[PDB]
Amino acid sequence: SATITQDTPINQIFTDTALAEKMKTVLGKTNVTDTVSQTDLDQVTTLQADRLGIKSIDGVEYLNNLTQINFSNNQLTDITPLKNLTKLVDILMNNNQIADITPLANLTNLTGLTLFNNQITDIDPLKNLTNLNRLELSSNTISDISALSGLTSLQQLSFGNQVTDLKPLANLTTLERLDISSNKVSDISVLAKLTNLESLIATNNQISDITPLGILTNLDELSLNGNQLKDIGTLASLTNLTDLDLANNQISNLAPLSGLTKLTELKLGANQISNISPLAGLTALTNLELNENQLEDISPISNLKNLTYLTLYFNNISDISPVSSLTKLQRLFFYNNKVSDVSSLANLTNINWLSAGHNQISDLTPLANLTRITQLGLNDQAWTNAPVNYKANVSIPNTVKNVTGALIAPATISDGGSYTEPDITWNLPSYTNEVSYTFSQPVTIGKGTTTFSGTVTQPLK
Amino acid sequence: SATITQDTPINQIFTDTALAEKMKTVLGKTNVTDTVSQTDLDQVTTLQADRLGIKSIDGVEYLNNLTQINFSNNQLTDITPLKNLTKLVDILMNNNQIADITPLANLTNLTGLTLFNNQITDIDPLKNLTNLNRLELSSNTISDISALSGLTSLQQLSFGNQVTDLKPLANLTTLERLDISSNKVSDISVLAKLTNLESLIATNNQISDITPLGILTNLDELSLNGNQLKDIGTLASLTNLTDLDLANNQISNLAPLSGLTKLTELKLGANQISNISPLAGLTALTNLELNENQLEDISPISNLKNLTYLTLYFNNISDISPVSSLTKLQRLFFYNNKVSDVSSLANLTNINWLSAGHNQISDLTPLANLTRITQLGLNDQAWTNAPVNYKANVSIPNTVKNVTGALIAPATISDGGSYTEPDITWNLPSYTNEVSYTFSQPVTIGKGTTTFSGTVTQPLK
Ligand SMILES: [Ca+2]
Ligand SMILES: [Ca+2]
Ligand SMILES: [Cl-]
Ligand SMILES: [Cl-]
Ligand SMILES: [Mg+2]
Ligand SMILES: [Mg+2]
């Protein structure tokens, strides 16, 4: 029956036990076998039933006056009980396993519909929901967005993950925030028509041509990470950008960014950058990511005195001293570089995460007073000493120093060699071109703990 | 392949996009296409991936060193990727849609397994998990618990929802906390063997005989609500009870509770209680529920001066004044009684929820200084006046008074009658045995708002 005709136990109406328990509370009852009438059911206008392990919403069709529901983070598959709930204005049902959204098709009073991370492919049922202003369909398996073409009140939209053809967006000029992350898009030409866009998230697509963005001057947040960008000249137009993510592309020429002085967050990791001089004027930056590039000279960063978070890992940097002037720096990552001298880092007392593994660091004494550290990385240093002559009996000084200034004794020594402060000594009865040793010393500075370890190579001439 | 043989993109290993995104963060990467090695995967020992909209855990089989996982509140169905993760000690996977737990069968290092609110019927796969000390299977569709019989290290157990036969519990004498709520149990005789039980939750079963509990003197928490209890004499043995729920039964004789002086929470709603004198000595009570009984004389509650929460709704109480001495009372519910005089409630200034609809209340002035109220209910009062003689022209005084002391004018008047302060007047040209009027006045006291409304009936002699 489409109505409750006699006072009926809650657990006969709501057959999912988790929903029945929720409804007991909502309906002001004390046991799921308590009876309710249609009138009692009609009092319910909102339902926040997220995270409850609900697998079925059978029974919800009797809650005729629902206007807002949240069933996010459940196990919903079948949503047919919503079909006739036409007073619904907002639905939150992200993080379920819904595939068939035909039951939404006549819910034309919907203004908000959140369905991200379900199993939806066919969005044709959304075609007539023309009052929508928020529609979230990211992390689904949609390939065809034709059904969106009439949704001309949309302000916020996302969808995924199989879309190639964006042409159905052409008339959606109200759009302000668009998230097309994780699709199969190369052609973003339609986006030039969406001149009200303030946020465009397009991570992990196949985009190489960003000229469509040139007239999108309202953009303040742009994520194009994980694409195929190289020429970013278009971005020079986008002077309202404050949050720009360009990581995992093929970019080398940063000159188009030089005038983007509102930027506060700039992500440029995993590109082909060797020259950051165009960044020198971006003095509002608080977060800058430059990992996995080809950097050696980082002197331009010294200008960026609002930085609190900086990544430089996986470069070819030997001179880290430009960061020494960044007083607000809280987290600094430069593992996998060629830094030997960390004397300049003694300045940085606001530092709480200092990650410097896989460098050429031999002496921790400059770090000794960095007592606000809570996370620390110093594993797997390596350096090669200047050569000395092969001799049958060769000695070199141990140079490895802990934070206290004490020498750290070798952990292993090659070629049968041995320690006694201060040298490492080898007897080499055969001709030999190299010897080496390692060290491995746990250390804590402030509250941050790591192993300071490394391999020292000594060429023999 | 059962191993990762070459550095492999995270999103090729973890095919569920939500899990891949989580794993990107766990593995210290910045894009789901970043590559990882088997060694990187082997660093992961714990995973907290609840509430993420994960539908598949494909890929988790490569995380060989996992010992603790939380995948609660997702959409998991198939858990075969766990089969060979034999270093697992704790799994939290409540609130999914798992049915087949065969993949757990060789995870013999498990000490904790939480699976409540899934779709599990067959628990035979748990048979050899003899190191379990916590096993949560409530809100499933289990009928046969034979597989539990060997799980002799269990301390905490729950299961549901089709169990009738509890005999497999007989040897589980380590059990301290058992939750058999929402099954089909009538025979709890086996429970007499579980003499270490401190908590027994058995809500919504078919229990009428609780004599098995007589030797379970370690019980401090007992929930038998929603059963078929009448004789509760056995409970007199259980002197360590502090939290006792007996709502929705057939109980009338409370004498067995009189010596349970550690009780702090006692729920007795929806029984056949008319005499609460046996409760008078339970002075540690902070919460007492007596709704839906046959109470008239509540004088014994006056002894219960630690009460903060009291329900009395759906009784036959006319004298509410015994509650006036309960200074700590925060929430008081007595809707659907026969209370006319609330003068005594002026004492209760700690009151924050006062629910008194469907009484005989005509004058709110005693409530006027209850300014800590935040929730208030005064709807649908009704009373019948003492009769007056039929006359062709009949008048009676309006007695309905708001918190301010002002008379509240009638909203409707029967039989064509009319108001002018102070009487309601009728012209009755035919013989008439009754007239009536209603009132309906929104009111706020402190921060609590309600409609003070009612129907006043005047018999004519
Ligand atoms: Ca309750
Ligand atoms: Ca990041
Ligand atoms: Cl250059
Ligand atoms: Cl009696
Ligand atoms: Mg951002
Ligand atoms: Mg309790």
User: Is B94 close to A53, i.e. CB distance below 8 A?
Assistant: yes
Residue A403 and residue A349 share a domain: no
Distance from C-alpha of B139 to C-alpha of A433, rounded to nearest angstrom? 71
- Contact criterion met (CB below 8 Å) for B237 and B259: no
Distance from C-alpha of B31 to C-alpha of B18, rounded to nearest angstrom? 13
Q: What is the residue whose two structure tokens read 């369905």?
A: A115
Q: What is the DSSP string of B416-458?
A: G-EEETTEEEEE-SS--SEEEEEEEEEEEETTEEEEEEEEEEE
Which residues on A lie below 8 Å from B291 (Cβ)?
30
Minimum CA–CA partner of B225 in chain A? A31
- Contact criterion met (CB below 8 Å) for A390 and A461: yes
Residue closest to B204 by CA, chosen among B189, B185, B219: B185
The H or E element containing residue A381 is strand A381-384
Q: Name A337's Cβ contacts closer than 8 Å, sequence gap at least 6.
A: A312, A313, A314, A315, A316, A317, A318, A320, A358, A359
Residue A328 burial (CB count, 10 A): 14
- The pocket of ion ligand 1, defined by CB under 5 A, consists of A 30
Given B362, B380, B398, the domain boundary residue is B380
The H or E element containing residue B24 is helix B17-26
Residue B451 and residue B376 share a domain: no
Bridge pairing between strands A112-114 and A134-142: parallel
CA B30 / ligand 2 centre spacing (Å): 5
**CATH number of the domain bearing residue B430:** 2.60.40.1220
User: Is B33 close to A248, i.e. CB distance below 8 A?
Assistant: yes
Residue B445 and residue B305 share a domain: no
B407 strand-pairing partners: B401
Minimum CA–CA partner of B267 in chain A? A30
DSSP code of A131?
T
User: Is A97 close to B55, i.e. CB distance below 8 A?
Assistant: yes
Which residues on A lie below 8 Å from B314 (Cβ)?
none
| Identity of the residue numbered B345 | L
User: Is A30 close to B291, i.e. CB distance below 8 A?
Assistant: yes
- Contact criterion met (CB below 8 Å) for A235 and A241: yes
Bridge pairing between strands B393-397 and B423-427: antiparallel
Peptide bond into A161 cis (omega under 30): yes
Distance from C-alpha of A314 to C-alpha of A433, rounded to nearest angstrom? 29
Torsion A30-A32-A33-A36 (CA) sign: positive
Backbone angles phi, psi at B441, to 5 degrees: -135, 110
Count CB pairs under 8 A between chains A and B. Answer: 80
**CATH number of the domain bearing residue B358:** 3.80.10.10
The H or E element containing residue A134 is strand A134-142
Torsion B337-B339-B344-B347 (CA) sign: positive
User: Is A53 close to B17, i.e. CB distance below 8 A?
Assistant: no
| Identity of the residue numbered B283 | T
Q: What is the residue whose two structure tokens read 């995380």?
A: B63
Residue A80 and residue A118 share a domain: yes
In total, how many domains does chain B have?
Answer: 2
Q: How many Cα atoms sit within 13 Å of B79 on the Cβ side?
A: 30
N-term to C-term CA, chain B: 95
| b/e burial code for range B302-336 (CB count within 10 A of at least 16 → b) | ebbebbbbbbbbbbebbbbbbbbbbeebbbbbbbb
Given B380, B396, B431, the domain boundary residue is B380
Distance from C-alpha of B106 to C-alpha of A417, rounded to nearest angstrom? 49
Residue B145 and residue B201 share a domain: yes
Q: Which two tokens stand for residue B247?
A: 């709502």
Residue B266 and residue B156 share a domain: yes
Residue A423 and residue A370 share a domain: no
Taking any CB pair shorter than 8 Å as contact, residues of chain A touching chain B are 17-18, 30-33, 51-53, 55, 73-75, 94-97, 116-119, 139, 161, 182, 204, 225-226, 247-248, 269-270, 291
Residue B398 and residue B317 share a domain: no
Distance from C-alpha of A205 to C-alpha of B78, rounded to nearest angstrom? 30
Q: What is the DSSP string of A407-428?
A: BPPPSEEGGG-EEETTEEEEE-
Experimental method: X-ray
Residue closest to B372 by CA, chosen among B351, B391, B357, B386: B351
Kindly compute the dihedral angle of the four CA atoms of residues A401, A403, A405, A411, in this order, to the nearest 10 degrees: -30
- Contact criterion met (CB below 8 Å) for A55 and B119: yes
Residue A186 and residue A113 share a domain: yes
Distance from C-alpha of B329 to C-alpha of B309, rounded to nearest angstrom? 6
Q: How many Cα atoms sit within 13 Å of B194 on the Cβ side?
A: 30
Distance from C-alpha of A108 to C-alpha of A88, rounded to nearest angstrom? 8
CA A245 / ligand 2 centre spacing (Å): 9
- Contact criterion met (CB below 8 Å) for B245 and B267: yes
* Domain coverage including residue A44: 1-380
Distance from C-alpha of A20 to C-alpha of A34, rounded to nearest angstrom? 10
Ligand found nearest the CA of A266:
5
Residue closest to B288 by CA, chosen among B306, B305, B265: B265
| b/e burial code for range A129-165 (CB count within 10 A of at least 16 → b) | bebbbbbbbbbbebbebebbebbebbbbbbbbbebee
Q: What is the residue whose two structure tokens read 């629902």?
A: A66
Q: Which two tokens stand for residue A390?
A: 């092969």
Residue closest to A257 by CA, chosen among A287, A277, A271: A277
Distance from C-alpha of B367 to C-alpha of B384, rounded to nearest angstrom? 23
Residue B425 and residue B353 share a domain: no
Residue B410 and residue B281 share a domain: no
- Contact criterion met (CB below 8 Å) for A274 and A254: no
- Contact criterion met (CB below 8 Å) for A216 and A238: yes
Residue A438 burial (CB count, 10 A): 17
Give me the count of residues in chain A: 461
- Contact criterion met (CB below 8 Å) for A106 and A87: no
Given A380, A412, A440, the domain boundary residue is A380
Distance from C-alpha of B356 to C-alpha of B333, rounded to nearest angstrom? 6
Which residues on A lie below 8 Å from B139 (Cβ)?
17-18, 53
User: Is A31 close to B182, i.e. CB distance below 8 A?
Assistant: no
Question: Is A47 in a helix, a strand, or coil?
Answer: strand
Residue B446 and residue B368 share a domain: no
Q: Which two tokens stand for residue B352?
A: 């924050």
Between A17, A51, A119, which is nearest B139 by CB? A17
Query: Closest approach of chain A CAs to the CA of B91, in angstroms?
Result: 17
Based on its alpha-carbon atoms, the radius of gyration of chain B, rounded to whole angstroms, reads 31
- Contact criterion met (CB below 8 Å) for A197 and A188: no
Resolution reached, in Å? 1.6
Distance from C-alpha of B88 to C-alpha of A267, rounded to nearest angstrom? 38
Please list the alpha-helical segments (H only) found in A196-336. none
